[PDB]
Design an enzyme around this catalytic site. Structure first.
Site, PDB file in Angstrom:
ATOM      1  N   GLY A   1      -3.549   2.561   8.486  1.00 12.19           N
ATOM      2  CA  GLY A   1      -4.001   1.229   8.055  1.00 12.19           C
ATOM      3  C   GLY A   1      -2.999   0.118   8.364  1.00 12.19           C
ATOM      4  O   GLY A   1      -2.950  -0.397   9.478  1.00 12.19           O
ATOM      5  N   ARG A   2      -2.180  -0.237   7.384  1.00  8.28           N
ATOM      6  CA  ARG A   2      -1.294  -1.397   7.513  1.00  8.28           C
ATOM      7  C   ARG A   2      -0.382  -1.319   8.733  1.00  8.28           C
ATOM      8  O   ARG A   2      -0.020  -2.354   9.309  1.00  8.28           O
ATOM      9  CB  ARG A   2      -0.410  -1.555   6.272  1.00  8.28           C
ATOM     10  CG  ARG A   2      -1.183  -1.919   5.018  1.00  8.28           C
ATOM     11  CD  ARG A   2      -0.327  -1.722   3.798  1.00  8.28           C
ATOM     12  NE  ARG A   2      -0.111  -0.309   3.557  1.00  8.28           N
ATOM     13  CZ  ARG A   2       0.899   0.180   2.840  1.00  8.28           C
ATOM     14  NH1 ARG A   2       1.812  -0.627   2.295  1.00  8.28           N
ATOM     15  NH2 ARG A   2       1.017   1.491   2.688  1.00  8.28           N
TER      16      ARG A   2
ATOM     17  N   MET B   1     -10.278  -1.962   6.510  1.00  9.38           N
ATOM     18  CA  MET B   1      -9.494  -2.931   5.741  1.00  9.38           C
ATOM     19  C   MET B   1     -10.225  -4.197   5.442  1.00  9.38           C
ATOM     20  O   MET B   1     -10.125  -5.168   6.173  1.00  9.38           O
ATOM     21  CB  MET B   1      -8.214  -3.238   6.503  1.00  9.38           C
ATOM     22  CG  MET B   1      -7.425  -1.934   6.559  1.00  9.38           C
ATOM     23  SD  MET B   1      -5.576  -2.299   7.035  1.00  9.38           S
ATOM     24  CE  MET B   1      -4.722  -3.489   5.708  1.00  9.38           C
ATOM     25  N   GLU B   2     -10.964  -4.178   4.346  1.00  6.26           N
ATOM     26  CA  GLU B   2     -11.679  -5.349   3.852  1.00  6.26           C
ATOM     27  C   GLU B   2     -10.807  -6.610   3.863  1.00  6.26           C
ATOM     28  O   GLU B   2      -9.718  -6.632   3.298  1.00  6.26           O
ATOM     29  CB  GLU B   2     -12.167  -5.072   2.425  1.00  6.26           C
ATOM     30  CG  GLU B   2     -12.875  -6.234   1.739  1.00  6.26           C
ATOM     31  CD  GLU B   2     -13.075  -6.002   0.250  1.00  6.26           C
ATOM     32  OE1 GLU B   2     -12.103  -5.652  -0.470  1.00  6.26           O
ATOM     33  OE2 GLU B   2     -14.227  -6.183  -0.202  1.00  6.26           O
TER      34      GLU B   2
ATOM     35  N   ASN C   1      -3.436  10.270   5.074  1.00  2.66           N
ATOM     36  CA  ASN C   1      -3.327   8.824   5.101  1.00  2.66           C
ATOM     37  C   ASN C   1      -2.284   8.340   4.144  1.00  2.66           C
ATOM     38  O   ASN C   1      -2.107   8.917   3.069  1.00  2.66           O
ATOM     39  CB  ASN C   1      -4.672   8.192   4.769  1.00  2.66           C
ATOM     40  CG  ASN C   1      -4.607   6.671   4.654  1.00  2.66           C
ATOM     41  OD1 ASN C   1      -4.923   6.118   3.615  1.00  2.66           O
ATOM     42  ND2 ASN C   1      -4.193   5.996   5.715  1.00  2.66           N
ATOM     43  N   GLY C   2      -1.577   7.291   4.558  1.00  2.00           N
ATOM     44  CA  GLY C   2      -0.602   6.585   3.722  1.00  2.00           C
ATOM     45  C   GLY C   2       0.830   6.659   4.237  1.00  2.00           C
ATOM     46  O   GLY C   2       1.371   7.771   4.451  1.00  2.00           O
ATOM     47  N   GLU C   3       1.441   5.483   4.410  1.00  2.00           N
ATOM     48  CA  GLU C   3       2.843   5.329   4.835  1.00  2.00           C
ATOM     49  C   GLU C   3       3.167   5.887   6.236  1.00  2.00           C
ATOM     50  O   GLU C   3       4.280   6.359   6.493  1.00  2.00           O
ATOM     51  CB  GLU C   3       3.817   5.903   3.790  1.00  2.00           C
ATOM     52  CG  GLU C   3       3.733   5.259   2.415  1.00  2.00           C
ATOM     53  CD  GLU C   3       4.038   3.777   2.443  1.00  2.00           C
ATOM     54  OE1 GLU C   3       5.167   3.408   2.845  1.00  2.00           O
ATOM     55  OE2 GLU C   3       3.158   2.988   2.040  1.00  2.00           O
TER      56      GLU C   3
ATOM     57  N   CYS D   1     -10.750   2.889  -3.059  1.00  2.00           N
ATOM     58  CA  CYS D   1     -10.410   1.491  -3.375  1.00  2.00           C
ATOM     59  C   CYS D   1     -10.713   1.040  -4.780  1.00  2.00           C
ATOM     60  O   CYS D   1     -11.812   1.259  -5.264  1.00  2.00           O
ATOM     61  CB  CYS D   1     -11.150   0.527  -2.442  1.00  2.00           C
ATOM     62  SG  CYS D   1     -10.408   0.538  -0.822  1.00  2.00           S
TER      63      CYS D   1
ATOM     64  N   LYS E   1     -13.532   9.333   1.779  1.00  2.00           N
ATOM     65  CA  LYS E   1     -12.148   8.958   1.647  1.00  2.00           C
ATOM     66  C   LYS E   1     -11.764   8.942   0.171  1.00  2.00           C
ATOM     67  O   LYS E   1     -12.431   8.310  -0.633  1.00  2.00           O
ATOM     68  CB  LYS E   1     -11.971   7.585   2.242  1.00  2.00           C
ATOM     69  CG  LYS E   1     -10.560   7.112   2.141  1.00  2.00           C
ATOM     70  CD  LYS E   1     -10.310   5.991   3.102  1.00  2.00           C
ATOM     71  CE  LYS E   1      -8.876   5.597   2.947  1.00  2.00           C
ATOM     72  NZ  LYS E   1      -8.796   4.141   2.816  1.00  2.00           N
TER      73      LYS E   1
HETATM   74  C1  LIG Z   1      -5.925  -5.340   2.329  1.00  2.00           C
HETATM   75  C2  LIG Z   1      -6.461  -3.922   2.330  1.00  2.00           C
HETATM   76  C3  LIG Z   1      -7.844  -3.686   2.395  1.00  2.00           C
HETATM   77  C4  LIG Z   1      -8.346  -2.352   2.385  1.00  2.00           C
HETATM   78  N1  LIG Z   1      -9.736  -2.187   2.458  1.00  2.00           N
HETATM   79  C5  LIG Z   1     -10.151  -0.963   2.474  1.00  2.00           C
HETATM   80  C6  LIG Z   1     -11.586  -0.725   2.585  1.00  2.00           C
HETATM   81  O1  LIG Z   1     -12.367  -1.589   2.795  1.00  2.00           O
HETATM   82  N2  LIG Z   1     -12.029   0.590   2.510  1.00  2.00           N
HETATM   83  C7  LIG Z   1     -11.161   1.714   2.367  1.00  2.00           C
HETATM   84  O2  LIG Z   1     -11.630   2.848   2.324  1.00  2.00           O
HETATM   85  N3  LIG Z   1      -9.782   1.497   2.307  1.00  2.00           N
HETATM   86  C8  LIG Z   1      -9.324   0.261   2.364  1.00  2.00           C
HETATM   87  N4  LIG Z   1      -7.963   0.081   2.297  1.00  2.00           N
HETATM   88  C9  LIG Z   1      -7.112   1.281   2.187  1.00  2.00           C
HETATM   89  C10 LIG Z   1      -6.709   1.747   3.596  1.00  2.00           C
HETATM   90  O3  LIG Z   1      -7.817   2.212   4.247  1.00  2.00           O
HETATM   91  C11 LIG Z   1      -5.592   2.824   3.554  1.00  2.00           C
HETATM   92  O4  LIG Z   1      -6.088   3.897   2.874  1.00  2.00           O
HETATM   93  C12 LIG Z   1      -4.282   2.331   2.864  1.00  2.00           C
HETATM   94  O5  LIG Z   1      -3.903   1.083   3.357  1.00  2.00           O
HETATM   95  C13 LIG Z   1      -3.165   3.403   3.050  1.00  2.00           C
HETATM   96  O6  LIG Z   1      -2.836   3.440   4.412  1.00  2.00           O
HETATM   97  P1  LIG Z   1      -1.480   2.836   5.032  1.00  2.00           P
HETATM   98  O7  LIG Z   1      -0.317   3.213   4.265  1.00  2.00           O
HETATM   99  O8  LIG Z   1      -1.616   3.312   6.542  1.00  2.00           O
HETATM  100  O9  LIG Z   1      -1.802   1.289   5.067  1.00  2.00           O
HETATM  101  C14 LIG Z   1      -7.432  -1.235   2.321  1.00  2.00           C
HETATM  102  C15 LIG Z   1      -6.021  -1.509   2.274  1.00  2.00           C
HETATM  103  C16 LIG Z   1      -5.557  -2.827   2.260  1.00  2.00           C
HETATM  104  C17 LIG Z   1      -4.082  -3.081   2.108  1.00  2.00           C
END
Ligand SMILES: Cc1cc2nc3c(=O)[nH]c(=O)nc-3n(C[C@H](O)[C@H](O)[C@H](O)COP(=O)(O)O)c2cc1C
Length: 318
Positions: free
Chosen positions: A227-228, A11-12, A203-205, A101, A142
């Site tokens: 992630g989140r 998560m950048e 991945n996601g939600e 991304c 990814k």
């Molecule tokens: C603020 C933010 C930054 C992210 N940065 C990256 C990143 O650097 N590289 C990447 O592959 N995914 C990145 N993602 C995507 C996440 O890795 C993930 O795929 C996405 O949030 C879906 O997962 P979730 O529903 O568990 O959050 C980022 C998501 C967010 C919201």
């Protein structure tokens, strides 16, 4: 009752080495992926890799022992390959390629989601990385399901397998669907898995134990990436693997106190405040108690005032 892998998503601008250190010590993540290294047409200096991924100096692990993998973002196979090789020389446990991304196209080199418009680019990228990483270390990729539809979702998947990648992470949305909850398609993750011979990581939600159960039952994946949710609920790996209740508020405050104690110690900067504000913004979704704190913390400018605010909260009287 089955084995299961949980990965901490990259998560950048939110997750750095310090947050990875804190979370891994109170979780069972199998692997964290770093925020991406932006590759254009150049071999990046060793300093860039070490500062993004300090774990490379501790055998590619957080201090509590969780493996970490360096991620790349970029299009040009020559340069992905050379940066992939450097990450590994420096000790990364394999290397990941970001095709999920949204990303600016700089100097004719796109990256991330823009590769989803032409799967051949993903094949060529991933394949060069696979050739440059010693064969026994992994190369992951990814992806999202496509740019503005899922029509190419199987082509994207094949491109990754045919390049000889080790495993595939599917963010089960298109790029234009963004982060909208109503569009997650865990079923398409499953359709992908069925077609492949490499592990697919859903991945996601994924927010909690039940969502993860639902996601795995539908996709058939025994691996997921959070992630989140990993910020909303700090012990989410344990919630998901073991049905632990969510970390109670007093333990999460204790964690944030520790954040601010390492903040100062690491010398991470006088105005290094964004990630601590962001974390609290995420914690409002799960803990009512964090709304009051976020308010008092959001109007603050610098890392010292923010620390005193947070480490003044008495965990006992709470
Ligand atoms: C603020 C933010 C930054 C992210 N940065 C990256 C990143 O650097 N590289 C990447 O592959 N995914 C990145 N993602 C995507 C996440 O890795 C993930 O795929 C996405 O949030 C879906 O997962 P979730 O529903 O568990 O959050 C980022 C998501 C967010 C919201």
């Amino acid at each position: 009752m089955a084995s299961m892998r949980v990965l901490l998503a990259p998560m950048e601008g939110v997750l750095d080495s310090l947050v990875r250190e804190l979370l891994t010590e109170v979780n069972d993540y199998d692997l964290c992926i770093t925020e991406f290294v932006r590759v254009v047409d150049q071999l990046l200096p060793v300093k860039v890799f070490h500062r993004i991924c300090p774990e490379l100096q501790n055998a590619s692990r957080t201090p509590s022992g969780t493996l970490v993998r360096v991620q790349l973002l970029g299009q040009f196979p020559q340069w992905l390959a050379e940066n992939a090789a450097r990450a590994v020389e420096l000790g990364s446990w394999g290397v990941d390629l970001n095709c999920g991304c949204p990303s600016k196209t700089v100097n004719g080199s796109g990256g991330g989601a823009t590769l989803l418009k032409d799967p051949e680019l993903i094949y060529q990228g991933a394949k060069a990385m696979r050739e440059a990483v010693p064969a026994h270390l992994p190369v992951s990729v990814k992806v999202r399901l496509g740019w503005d539809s899922g029509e190419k979702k199987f082509e994207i998947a094949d491109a990754v397998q045919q390049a000889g990648a080790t495993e595939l992470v599917v963010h089960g949305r298109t790029k234009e669907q963004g982060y909208r909850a109503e569009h997650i398609d865990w079923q398409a993750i499953g359709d992908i898995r069925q077609r492949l011979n490499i592990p697919v990581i859903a991945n996601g939600e994924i927010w909690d134990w039940q969502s993860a159960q639902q996601c795995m039952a539908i996709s058939g994946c025994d691996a997921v990436m959070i992630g989140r949710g990993a910020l909303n609920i700090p012990n989410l790996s344990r919630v998901v693997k073991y049905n632990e209740p969510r970390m109670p508020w007093p333990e999460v405050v204790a964690l944030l106190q520790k954040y601010t104690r390492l903040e100062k110690q690491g010398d991470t900067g006088l105005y290094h405040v964004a990630r601590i504000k962001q974390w609290l913004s995420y914690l409002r979704k799960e803990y009512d108690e964090a709304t009051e704190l976020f308010q008092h913390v959001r109007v603050l400018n610098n890392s010292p005032d923010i620390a005193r605010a947070i480490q003044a909260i008495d965990i006992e009287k709470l």
